[PDB]
Amino acid sequence: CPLMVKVLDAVRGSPAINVAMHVFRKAADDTWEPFASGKTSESGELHGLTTEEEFVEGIYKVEIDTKSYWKALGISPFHEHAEVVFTANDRYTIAALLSPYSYSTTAVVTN
Amino acid sequence: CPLMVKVLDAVRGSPAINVAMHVFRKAADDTWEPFASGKTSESGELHGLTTEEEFVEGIYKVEIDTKSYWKALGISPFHEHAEVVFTANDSGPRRYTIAALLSPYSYSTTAVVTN
Amino acid sequence: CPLMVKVLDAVRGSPAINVAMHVFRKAADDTWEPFASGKTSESGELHGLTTEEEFVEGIYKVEIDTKSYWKALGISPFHEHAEVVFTANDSGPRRYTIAALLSPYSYSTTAVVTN
Amino acid sequence: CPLMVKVLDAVRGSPAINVAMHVFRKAADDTWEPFASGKTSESGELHGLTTEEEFVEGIYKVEIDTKSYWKALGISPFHEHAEVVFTANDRYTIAALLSPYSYSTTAVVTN
Ligand SMILES: O=C(/C=C/c1ccc(O)c(O)c1)O[C@H](Cc1ccc(O)c(O)c1)C(=O)O
Ligand SMILES: O=C(/C=C/c1ccc(O)c(O)c1)O[C@H](Cc1ccc(O)c(O)c1)C(=O)O
Question: Residue C99 needs a FRET pair 20 to 30 A away by CA distance; which of A77, B12, C43, D108 works?
C-alpha cells in the first residue's frame, strides 16, 4: 500500500463511507490520465489503489467526489469535489476531513 | 483593537453570528480571571474586547461557546466549546486575530499576529 | 467584488502574501478556460478578479500556487497547489469569499457565500 | 479502548510522536480532576487511556501539550496547548492536526 486515502465527515463525526474517488497521473502533454479509483470502506479508508512498482515518481491528482456524498445526505455542498494534487518523490496516506462548505486535507508520509 | 475574534460556520458557509465567548487571563496565583466577553456580530467578528493599555503580557484563554451556537441550529455538537490558549505580548505589543472555523464534530483555529 | 480569495499561513501566523492564483471556468465543451488571475496583497487578500456582469453561472476552479509560496520560504511542501472547484450563481448572484489556510503538508479551505 | 487520541504534524507530514497529554473529568465543583494521561506513540496514537467501566457520562477535557512539541522541533508556536472539551454520552477517537499557529481537531465516534 504505497498510497492510501482516508475520508472523514465533520458533520456526523464518522468515517465518510462509500465516497468515490479517482486518482490520475499527469502525462507528458499535461493531461490527466486515469490511474486508479475506488470508494471508501466502512472505516472511511480506500486501500489497494496501486503497487510499489506502478507508483513511480510523477504528479498525481486524487479527485474525491464530495458532492455526491453530501447530496446523498441531503445537505447542500459548496465544492464540486475535493482535489489533492502532489508530486511523489523517492508510504503516502492522504486524509480529507469534509464539511459542506469546507474541507481540509493532510498528508502523512512515512517509512 | 489588539484582540479580535472571528468565527465561521463550515456547514452553512457563513459567518457564525451571535456566538458568545469569554476571555480569561491567568493570574499570579495561576487561576483564570475573567478578562472580557462578548458575542460575534453579523460579520462573525467580535471587536473591542480590550485596549492596548489593558492587554498586558500574560497567558490568555478564549472560550468560544460553540455548543450553544449549534444547539440553536438544531444540532447536538461534539464539543462543549472551542478553547484558544496563548501567551500574548511576550516580545512587546502585537495585534492578535483569532479565527475559528466550526463544524458539528470538528473545529479549526488559527491566529494572525501582526506588529 | 463577487469573488475574493484570502490565503493565510499557519506556520508563521500571518497572511500569505504574494501568492499567485489562476481562476478557470468550465466551457461548453467541458474544458477549463482561463477566467482571471492575480496574487494576494499584504493582507493575504486578492480582490477585483471579476465583476458581477462577467461572473455568470458556471463551474469555476481556483488554483492557488501554494508550492511556489512554500519554496520561496525554503520549504518543500506536499501539494502542487490548492484547488477549489465550485458551481457559482446557480440560484442567482452571490458574493463568494474563498479562504485557504496553508501548512507545508496540509491545507484547509472554506467558502463564505452571501446574498 | 473507549477513547483514543491521535495527533498529526502538518509541517512535517507525519504522526506527532511523543506528544504528552492529560485527560481530565469535570467534577461537581466545576474543577478539573486528573483522569488519565500519556504520550503519543510512533504512530501518533495514544491508546489505553481508560476502560468501558471507568469512562462514564460526563464532561471531559483532553489537554494536548503542543507547545512542548513545537519547542523540541525549534519552531515558535502560538498556543500553550490544544484543548478538546466534550461530553461523553451513552468509541471515541479524537484527532488533532497541528501547525505552529493553528490546530484542527475532529471526533470520530463509532460503534
Ligand atoms: O486522523 C486523521 C485525520 C485527522 C485530521 C484532523 C483534522 C484535519 O483537518 C484533517 O484534515 C485530518 O487521519 C489518520 C490517517 C491515517 C489513517 C489510517 C492509517 O493507517 C494511517 O496510517 C493514517 C487517521 O484517521 O488515523
Ligand atoms: O476568518 C478567516 C478564515 C480563517 C480560517 C480558519 C480555519 C480554517 O480551516 C480556514 O480554512 C480558514 O480568516 C480571516 C481572519 C481575519 C484576519 C484579519 C482581519 O482583519 C480580519 O478582519 C479577519 C478573514 O476572515 O479575513
Answer: D108
